[PDB]
Design an enzyme around this catalytic site. Structure first.
Site, mmCIF file in Angstrom:
data_model
loop_
_atom_site.group_PDB
_atom_site.id
_atom_site.type_symbol
_atom_site.label_atom_id
_atom_site.label_comp_id
_atom_site.label_asym_id
_atom_site.label_seq_id
_atom_site.Cartn_x
_atom_site.Cartn_y
_atom_site.Cartn_z
ATOM 1 N N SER A 25 0.817 -1.209 0.000
ATOM 2 C CA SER A 25 0.000 0.000 0.000
ATOM 3 C C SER A 25 0.854 1.264 0.000
ATOM 4 O O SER A 25 2.060 1.213 0.246
ATOM 5 C CB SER A 25 -0.948 0.019 1.204
ATOM 6 O OG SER A 25 -0.234 0.230 2.413
ATOM 7 N N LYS A 63 -6.441 -3.728 -7.006
ATOM 8 C CA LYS A 63 -5.823 -2.448 -6.682
ATOM 9 C C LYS A 63 -6.865 -1.368 -6.411
ATOM 10 O O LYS A 63 -7.635 -0.994 -7.299
ATOM 11 C CB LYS A 63 -4.890 -2.010 -7.814
ATOM 12 C CG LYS A 63 -4.150 -0.702 -7.551
ATOM 13 C CD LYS A 63 -3.125 -0.433 -8.648
ATOM 14 C CE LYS A 63 -2.302 0.814 -8.357
ATOM 15 N NZ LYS A 63 -1.271 1.053 -9.420
ATOM 16 N N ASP A 77 8.032 5.097 -14.286
ATOM 17 C CA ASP A 77 8.524 4.611 -12.994
ATOM 18 C C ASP A 77 9.144 3.217 -13.111
ATOM 19 O O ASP A 77 8.907 2.340 -12.276
ATOM 20 C CB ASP A 77 7.406 4.652 -11.941
ATOM 21 C CG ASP A 77 7.931 4.525 -10.506
ATOM 22 O OD1 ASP A 77 9.132 4.807 -10.260
ATOM 23 O OD2 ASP A 77 7.130 4.139 -9.621
HETATM 24 C C1 8GX Z 1 3.105 -0.444 -2.875
HETATM 25 O O1 8GX Z 1 2.666 -1.664 -3.471
HETATM 26 C C2 8GX Z 1 2.133 -1.670 -4.766
HETATM 27 C C3 8GX Z 1 1.861 -0.469 -5.437
HETATM 28 C C4 8GX Z 1 1.318 -0.489 -6.723
HETATM 29 C C5 8GX Z 1 1.064 -1.708 -7.324
HETATM 30 C C6 8GX Z 1 1.341 -2.927 -6.648
HETATM 31 C C7 8GX Z 1 1.890 -2.957 -5.350
HETATM 32 C C8 8GX Z 1 2.210 -4.219 -4.545
HETATM 33 N N1 8GX Z 1 3.659 -4.729 -4.739
HETATM 34 C C9 8GX Z 1 4.049 -4.768 -6.157
HETATM 35 C C10 8GX Z 1 5.408 -5.487 -6.339
HETATM 36 N N2 8GX Z 1 6.501 -4.758 -5.577
HETATM 37 C C11 8GX Z 1 6.094 -4.647 -4.106
HETATM 38 C C12 8GX Z 1 4.710 -3.942 -3.998
HETATM 39 O O2 8GX Z 1 1.006 -4.007 -7.443
HETATM 40 C C13 8GX Z 1 0.488 -3.546 -8.678
HETATM 41 C C14 8GX Z 1 0.053 -4.307 -9.689
HETATM 42 C C15 8GX Z 1 -0.031 -5.766 -9.807
HETATM 43 C C16 8GX Z 1 -0.646 -6.425 -10.861
HETATM 44 N N3 8GX Z 1 -0.565 -7.803 -10.699
HETATM 45 C C17 8GX Z 1 0.125 -8.062 -9.513
HETATM 46 C C18 8GX Z 1 0.463 -9.292 -8.925
HETATM 47 N N4 8GX Z 1 1.136 -9.322 -7.773
HETATM 48 C C19 8GX Z 1 1.478 -8.118 -7.197
HETATM 49 C C20 8GX Z 1 1.187 -6.871 -7.710
HETATM 50 C C21 8GX Z 1 0.474 -6.796 -8.922
HETATM 51 C C22 8GX Z 1 0.508 -2.041 -8.649
HETATM 52 O O3 8GX Z 1 0.139 -1.280 -9.528
#
Ligand code: 8GX
EC number: 2.7.11.1
Length: 270
Positions: free
Chosen positions: A11, A32, A132
């Protein structure tokens, strides 16, 4: 209702991401939640509906197969948007991967970097600038050895003129942004790719402070081949126009003889 929500994956101020399962087929998804009052950039669908720009961007790139995570569906709520995203399994993001295993062998770095390049090329061809690119925004499908780009929440429509806004990651941002708050899309992307490639082969990013970024001197803390060092230093040229195009990157001698994803998984992930 249509999805079984699982554990929180991460998050921020933008919102929150959960693991999930589509009830209709047990397909793994990511869910999300994006807060409305924290959306800087709004876009429009044909129908005219205001949506987060990320939705517009994702629709532009979610056509067909690619190394970009696909938007499966989305929903509007009174104070948020909910995005249903593709979720490979098992996965690990590149940041955690490098953290656990340290600097990557060049053969592995070459495979990963190549896939990222192909994913970024796909974005640009679809008129999308990610803005990014970094280890945290790259997912590794550990079984297939395929990489996926995620989080277009800082992205924009690709254009040939100057950008004056930026809400990506600072240490991956180019000197022209730090100094003049101005950059062009492709050359700024190439800079972040240089940071990424250094990160892969050295196990950490090359610059921490603004002054190091604008100085642009690259010190190698790990043994790295001369060809790789050359590609990295080229991507991190101080002058944007001195940076290579995507084609020049992929035709670079260090980039030759890339492994296939499954080969990569067999040798390096299994
Ligand atoms: C701060 O955490 C975030 C912020 C934005 C997104 C997110 C995440 C969670 N993880 C992501 C990986 N690095 C650590 C943080 O995930 C996303 C999209 C995803 C699509 N398919 C998936 C499958 N697994 C995880 C994730 C996603 C995002 O836009």
């Amino acid at each position: 209702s249509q999805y079984q929500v699982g554990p929180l994956l991460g998050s921020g101020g933008f919102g929150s991401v959960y693991s999930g399962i589509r009830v209709s087929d047990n397909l793994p998804v990511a869910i999300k939640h994006v807060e409305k009052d924290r959306i800087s950039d709004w876009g429009e669908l044909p129908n005219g509906t205001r949506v987060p720009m990320e939705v517009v961007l994702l629709k532009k790139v979610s056509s067909g197969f690619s190394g970009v995570i696909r938007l499966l569906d989305w929903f509007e709520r009174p104070d948020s948007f909910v995005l249903i995203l593709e979720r490979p399994e098992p996965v690990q993001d590149l940041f955690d991967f490098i953290t656990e295993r340290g600097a990557l062998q060049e053969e592995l770095a070459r495979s990963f970097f190549w896939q990222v390049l192909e994913a970024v090329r796909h974005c640009h061809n679809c008129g999308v600038l990610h803005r990014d690119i970094k280890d945290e925004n790259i997912l590794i499908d550990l079984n297939r050895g395929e990489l996926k780009l995620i989080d277009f929440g800082s992205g924009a429509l690709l254009k040939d003129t100057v950008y004056t806004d930026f809400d990506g990651t600072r240490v991956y941002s180019p000197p022209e942004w730090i100094r003049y708050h101005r950059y062009h899309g492709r050359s700024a992307a190439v800079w972040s790719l240089g940071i990424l490639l250094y990160d892969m082969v050295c196990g950490d990013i090359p610059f921490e402070h603004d002054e190091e970024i604008i100085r642009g001197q690259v010190f190698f803390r790990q043994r790295v081949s001369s060809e790789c060092q050359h590609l990295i230093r080229w991507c991190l040229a101080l002058r944007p126009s001195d940076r290579p195009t995507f084609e020049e990157i992929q035709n670079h001698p260090w980039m030759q003889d890339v492994l296939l994803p499954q080969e990569t998984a067999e040798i390096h992930l299994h």
